[PDB]
Structure formats: C-alpha cells, structure tokens
Amino acid sequence: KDILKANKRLADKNRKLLNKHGVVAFDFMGAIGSGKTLLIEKLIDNLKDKYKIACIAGDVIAKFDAERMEKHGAKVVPLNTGKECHLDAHLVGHALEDLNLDEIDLLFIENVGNLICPADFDLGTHKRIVVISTTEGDDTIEKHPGIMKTADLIVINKIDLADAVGADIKKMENDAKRINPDAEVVLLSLKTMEGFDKVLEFIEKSVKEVK
Amino acid sequence: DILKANKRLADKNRKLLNKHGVVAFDFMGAIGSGKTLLIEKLIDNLKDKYKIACIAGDVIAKFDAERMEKHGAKVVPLNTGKECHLDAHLVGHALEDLNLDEIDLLFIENVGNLICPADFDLGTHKRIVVISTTEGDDTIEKHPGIMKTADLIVINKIDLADAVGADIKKMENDAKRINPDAEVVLLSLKTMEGFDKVLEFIEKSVKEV
Ligand SMILES: Nc1nc2c(ncn2[C@@H]2O[C@H](COP(=O)(O)OP(=O)(O)OP(O)(O)=S)[C@@H](O)[C@H]2O)c(=O)[nH]1
Ligand SMILES: Nc1nc2c(ncn2[C@@H]2O[C@H](COP(=O)(O)OP(=O)(O)OP(O)(O)=S)[C@@H](O)[C@H]2O)c(=O)[nH]1
Ligand SMILES: [Mg+2]
Ligand SMILES: [Mg+2]
Ligand SMILES: [Zn+2]
Ligand SMILES: [Zn+2]
Ligand SMILES: [Zn+2]
Ligand SMILES: [Zn+2]
C-alpha cells in the first residue's frame, strides 16, 4: 500500500494553497464527544471580531455539527465520511474548493471522533489539536500514545466532571506532557470556561509563527 | 473482499463456540463509554453461576485485561496496534488460547470506536453497544450503522446527563427509532441503576441459545 505517501503529497499541496491565500488551518481531533464542536463554537465567538473564520466539519453524518457551527456565523463545508474512520488530505483539498480563501483568515477542521486512525492522516493543516475529556477515564492518554505524538496542542477537557468519574487530571496532564514533550497541554472546562485563555493563546501564537 | 473472509471466519468462530457450549458477547462502544466497568460488574454477578472468559482488545490491551483478571476471569489480551477494530481472524486465534470446555460465557471488549466495528462480525451470539451521556445526546443518531447491529443498546453514565446537558429521553428514543429490535437500557454503573436490566439480557441470551 502506498496510501500514506500519496496523502502527504496532497497535504503539502493543501498547505501551500492555504499559505498562498494567508489561511492558517487547525485540525481538531479527539475521541467521541470530547468537546471538539463546542471548542470550535467558542473559538468562533471569541475570534470572529479579529478573523474571518471558515470550518470543515467531518463525520458519519456531518450536518449535526455543520449546523452548530453555522449558527455562529462561520461558513462551513460539511464532509459526510460514512463508513470511513478518518479524513484525508484528498477530501479536505476538495472541501477547500468550496471556500473563498481570500476572504478567510482561519480554518477550523473538525476531524472524525477517533483516537486511532487520524494519527496517520495529515490533512494539510499548520497545527494539530487533540481533544480528550476526563469522562473517557484518566488512562485515555497513555492508552493512545500514537495520536498524542502528532498533536501540537493536547486539550484535557471537561475538568469540571473529573471527580464525578474519578479521573485524576494531574495524572492526565502529566501523561500528555511525558508522551509528547513538544506539545502544549491545556486543562479546560468549556462549561466554566477555565483554561480557554490558554487555547486562545495557542491559536494566536500559531498564527504569528506560520512559515 | 476482506469482509467475505471475515464472515467466513465469524461463522467458523461461532461454530466452535456452539460446539463447546460457549455463549459469546461483543461489547462495542465509544472511547471511555464504560465497556470494561460493565464487564467487571458482569463478572462479579455471574462468576458463581458461570465460568467466564474475556478477550480484551485495544492498542495497549494490558490495561483492561488486568482490570478483568482481578475479578476472576480468564482473559486473553489482544493488542490491536494501529488497527481500529477487532475481526473474526484475531478472535479466532484468541479462542485457540482458551479452554472452551472450561468456559460458559465469553465477553469480548472491542476497540473503542463507533464506526468500523459495525462492519466486522467477530463470531459472537449477541452484540452490545455501550454509549454514554457525556459523549453528547446526538451520539446515537450520529452513528446509525453500529446501532443497527446491536442486540442491546446501553446508554451509560445517566448520573452525569444533567452535567453535560444530555437529554436521556432523546437518546432512548433515537435508539429505539433506529433499531426497533434492540433492547435499550438506561444505565449508571456508578449508582447501578439499570444494571439489573443488563444482567437480565445476558442471562436470557445464554438460556436462549
Ligand atoms: N460539563 C461539561 N460538558 C462539556 C464540556 N465540553 C463539552 N461538553 C458537553 O459534552 C458533549 C459533547 O460535546 P461536543 O462538542 O458535541 O463533542 P464533540 O467532540 O464535537 O463530539 P462528536 O460527536 O463530534 S465526536 C455536549 O453535551 C457538550 O455540552 C465541558 O467542558 N464540561
Ligand atoms: N460517573 C460515572 N462514571 C462511569 C460510569 N461508567 C463508567 N464510568 C467511568 O468512566 C471511565 C471509563 O470507563 P471504562 O470502563 O474504562 O470505559 P471503556 O469503555 O472500557 O474505555 P476504553 O478505554 O476501554 S475505550 C472510568 O473512569 C469509569 O469509572 C457511570 O455510569 N457513571
Ligand atoms: Mg462534534
Ligand atoms: Mg475498556
Ligand atoms: Zn480529487
Ligand atoms: Zn481506521
Ligand atoms: Zn477499523
Ligand atoms: Zn492469523
């Protein structure tokens, strides 16, 4: 199989096109229901005064999250993935054709909920974000090191629920730091909004550092 | 067609299990839904009546295998690597490492994944999908494929439903609409509310083979 080699070529092409039009793109990965959509929703709300934001929403049935993002004023391209367990640069490249990249500053891509397959499939983004939550259990990070090593930012979300599931958030934070020393690691609650400042900081730092 | 090869091996697996009087269950779900904790509780309640074995499938299978072992089950760990689902082939090899004449119940924990496990019959008698409220109340209608393969749909962590804004009535209705033939149970493994209904499904399923 030559799958991963052909994907990378398309990812580099995606990145070059985005750079050509001054677009900074983020890949939002995570487990099922970790909080990817709600994070994106909050990011749109709090950055739209400064940036023109577009989204690509990928899932079995993309409409649910597409509709959520749209009500926040962002242009969304939905991608129904169906039986596929991941997105790829090929599909993302075609979604880009539906966007006016000259009228876009930021691109948020919500990947399929999956802590395994998306690790191998570069989409052509500048940064990769992995979102997990306390409610998945505090062994979630050490159980899935592969995807963690591909992240630029690891978000441990739903910290407000940690005690209710018996999750040690300090342990999780340390797991993340240890498995990927180069990543930023943020403890977040999208309910209380604690930690959100650090996610915004990551977005802004990323924009300034491009190329 | 790798799915044709899988079906062939699934029928082979099921044939072997029937031969030795073993009833097998495929526990599917999202990541952290509560598959292992449900199996742990099932072992505790059933181990006096039945000889129980387990297959624990995950990237690093030791975590769940050890959790199951302390409850008094024979467990075969299955490291799934970069593969995102168990298949009949891998399960067939695990069955070769089990003494099936000394086993009544087989519990298989599939990889945490609501997509591709729907396509890969393992050779079990019943399929169970565990989701949880903390994944959001759109989770069931977002994954109809896997839902239609389930004999039992478990909506777990009802104790945390209000905290995440999940409507458990919606989730229960979504499940029944998508799979009218499935049993649907509202569960908290913390409080144990609904556990009796899951246990009833297991015991009935065993007697019905
Ligand atoms: N209490 C609490 N609930 C949260 C938090 N973050 C997200 N949620 C809740 O979790 C559920 C899932 O959030 P959602 O944004 O849909 O996850 P997702 O990762 O996008 O889910 P997916 O289906 O696409 S895979 C929702 O009910 C949402 O309100 C949090 O920090 N604290
Ligand atoms: N509050 C509450 N917590 C629960 C409930 N069910 C499971 N949990 C918690 O959720 C976390 C994950 O449970 P676990 O049994 O490990 O899920 P899993 O499906 O086996 O997770 P995986 O990594 O193999 S994919 C654990 O910390 C467990 O205590 C519940 O009903 N209520
Ligand atoms: Mg989402
Ligand atoms: Mg488990
Ligand atoms: Zn094409
Ligand atoms: Zn996969
Ligand atoms: Zn798979
Ligand atoms: Zn083999």
Q: Short description, anyone?
A:
The first copy, chain A, is α/β, with parallel strands linked by helices and 211 residues long.
Question: What is the strand and helix layout of this fold?
Answer:
The structure is a homodimer.
Chain A: H1 3-20, E1 24-30, H2 36-47, E2 53-59, H3 63-70, E3 75-80, H4 89-96, E4 106-110, E5 127-133, H5 140-143, H6 145-148, E6 153-157, H7 162-165, H8 169-179, E7 184-187, H9 196-209
Parallel strand pairs in A: 1-4, 1-5, 2-3, 2-4, 5-6, 6-7
One magnesium ion binds at residues 35-36, 64, 109 of chain B.
InterPro entries (chain A): CobW/HypB/UreG_nucleotide-bd, Hyd_mat_HypB, P-loop_NTPase
Protein name (chain A): Probable hydrogenase maturation factor HypB
Family (chain A): Belongs to the SIMIBI class G3E GTPase family. HypB/HupM subfamily.
